Curated annotation (Swiss-Prot), chain B:
SUPFAM superfamilies: PLP-dependent transferases (SSF53383). It comes from Geobacter metallireducens (strain ATCC 53774 / DSM 7210 / GS-15). GO terms for molecular function: histidinol-phosphate transaminase activity; pyridoxal phosphate binding. Its cofactor is pyridoxal 5'-phosphate. Belongs to the class-II pyridoxal-phosphate-dependent aminotransferase family. Histidinol-phosphate aminotransferase subfamily. Pathway: Amino-acid biosynthesis; L-histidine biosynthesis; L-histidine from 5-phospho-alpha-D-ribose 1-diphosphate: step 7/9. GO terms for biological process: L-histidine biosynthetic process. This is Histidinol-phosphate aminotransferase.
Length: 349, 350
């Protein structure tokens, strides 16, 4: 039978290419953490699983309230300002379902997370994108944006820069609707915008454990917003959105801030070292606040270099988007992996 | 807060009541399996996790293709006719998003899974429910149902009976939109309706490992439908909807059919024994094809019995709905737990 027209017409999300066999590869294409999650996460999962996995026959916590209390203490927010999710894509999706009816508009920055658009298409919401200027400010933003939701990836991926808090504050005041600050990479930056959730009423911040907590293999994320917004999101989400092992992992991960800090320290160290090394062989590198770098070879032939890396079993991300085709987004792996990647880049020339 | 009107006005799903500390309780309120999952599942999870959880830093299989291949071999369907999900609620939700635009209608049986309505409310779809007749057929069903999606829980929960394949076939032919056969409890039944996915084009079957495979704490579900339907559902779901441990568990669970069969056999045996014992003390028990029973005491005071069980640390499910208030839905636990429950029921009856 007939699907909704928009569902029939839309094209599914197109991820970056990745070969099925990646065992013998240095994988730097999806911004995954180079280090394992906290040893406390492993213990927590094993302890929840038990000797025969009997605990898995019982439904998990629908509320994930214990996760909200731990997250609440970490960020300094009452638990009613927090909601857990099976990865942050879930909250992005539900924010659209909560605020944008079919036909209404949502917006975001080009380039950023193209999936914001895919989610809009499923809802039937219209999409409007805005580009960035040389000094990384939104170009052509109206006096007042009337879209129902605006998604700002901050720090911005794939480019890397963060937006000054005062500038995001301005954007919040100019948005008639909701401003969603996607802070997927904020743990790698020198600052974040959590304070804006308190300063305004239309600001929402999303976080995920996929990048900074080395749990991309698990789907754990959250959103921080005014209680009224969280209340609406709680009615929309599936009553059971996080399994028992994910809940055990989440609490352990958030509690081990020492490990998180050490991992982020090491990644930032490698990021800055690699930035200088790339520039030493003629590459243009955008200063980054995330766990990746957008680099452009001297000849601006990003695909040529991507092919050279692929031939050497090094996988990075290359965008066909004309705006980004000149370079590539390289995730920051272990220092050893980046030394090998640099060696390959030198051979490629 | 500028919320869509339907979102602002809707009431969030209201689950059955359950106390925080029930470690010393006999829990029979959410149809959870009384037995642990397959030992192969525990092994699979341990292997994927590894000694340091290093594998968890890498994203899972976005496609879950391996799971579809295993499920395909189990059910006799090409993998293109299958889609995996983080619990079947996810596929129920996406079926609504795929076929019912705001303002359009979806329907289901009263009583069944009220969450079908909650999901419809989020979408902004209208909801129409139909009651059942004495012979377990849908009362007042139109000659042709025009709703975009009709959800049929089969076996039906909370009542228990499965709808005969022949009758579901009739419903498929009478539905102008999609007919979704929620087979959450089919592994406990004598038969199922998988064949209808092949016979018709508008039929979809959902399954979950939450009840029959003892993995309610690791929500893994799936849907079987024509490739074109699966294709649409694949564009709607999040690219990463199942974690690495869940993918490991799913393959192991589906492959251990011996364990599944044994668990289902033990549950069916306890179910039938308990059914007989309840009738012997005056209860009316609807013949069930699931892992639960809808039982009504001789005095038709289900809430009194529920309260009596609660006082004795036995938790079942009681519905305030006038149609179901006289009885209760009792999940099937271990034989020992049901003997204790029977003893409690006899005392409450006296
Ligand atoms: Mg006594």
């Amino acid at each position: 039978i007939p699907l909704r027209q928009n569902i029939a017409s839309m094209k599914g999300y197109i991820p970056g290419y990745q070969p099925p066999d990646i065992a013998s590869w240095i994988k730097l294409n999806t911004n995954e953490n180079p280090y394992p999650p906290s040893p406390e996460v492993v213990k927590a999962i094993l302890e929840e699983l038990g000797p025969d996995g009997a605990a898995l026959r019982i439904y998990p916590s629908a509320s994930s309230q214990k996760l909200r209390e731990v997250a609440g203490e970490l960020y300094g927010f009452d638990p009613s300002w927090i909601i857990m999710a099976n990865g942050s894509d879930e909250v992005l999706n539900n924010l659209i379902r909560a605020f944008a009816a079919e036909g209404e508009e949502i917006g975001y920055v080009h380039p950023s997370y193209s999936y914001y658009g895919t989610l809009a298409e499923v809802q039937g919401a219209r999409v409007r994108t805005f580009g960035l200027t040389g000094d990384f400010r939104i170009a052509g933003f109206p006096e007042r944006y009337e879209g129902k939701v605006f998604f700002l990836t901050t720090p911005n991926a794939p480019l890397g820069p963060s937006f000054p808090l005062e500038y995001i504050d301005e954007l919040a005041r100019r948005c008639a609707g909701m401003l969603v600050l996607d802070e997927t990479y904020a743990e790698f930056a020198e600052s974040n915008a959590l304070e804006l959730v308190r300063r305004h009423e239309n600001v929402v911040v999303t976080r995920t454990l996929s990048k900074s907590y080395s749990l991309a293999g698990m789907r754990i994320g959250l959103a921080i917003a005014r209680p009224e917004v969280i209340a609406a999101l709680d009615k929309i989400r599936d009553h059971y959105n996080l399994d028992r092992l994910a809940q055990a992992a989440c609490v352990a991960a958030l509690r081990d801030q020492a490990y998180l800090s050490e991992c982020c320290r090491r990644i930032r160290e490698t990021r800055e070292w690699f930035t200088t090394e790339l520039r030493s062989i003629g590459y243009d590198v955008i200063p980054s606040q995330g766990n990746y770098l957008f680099a452009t070879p001297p000849d601006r032939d990003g695909k040529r270099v991507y092919d050279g890396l692929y031939a050497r079993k090094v996988l990075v991300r290359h965008f066909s988007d004309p705006l980004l085709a000149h370079g590539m987004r390289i995730s920051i792996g272990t220092r050893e992996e980046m030394e090998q990647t640099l060696a390959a880049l030198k051979e490629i020339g």
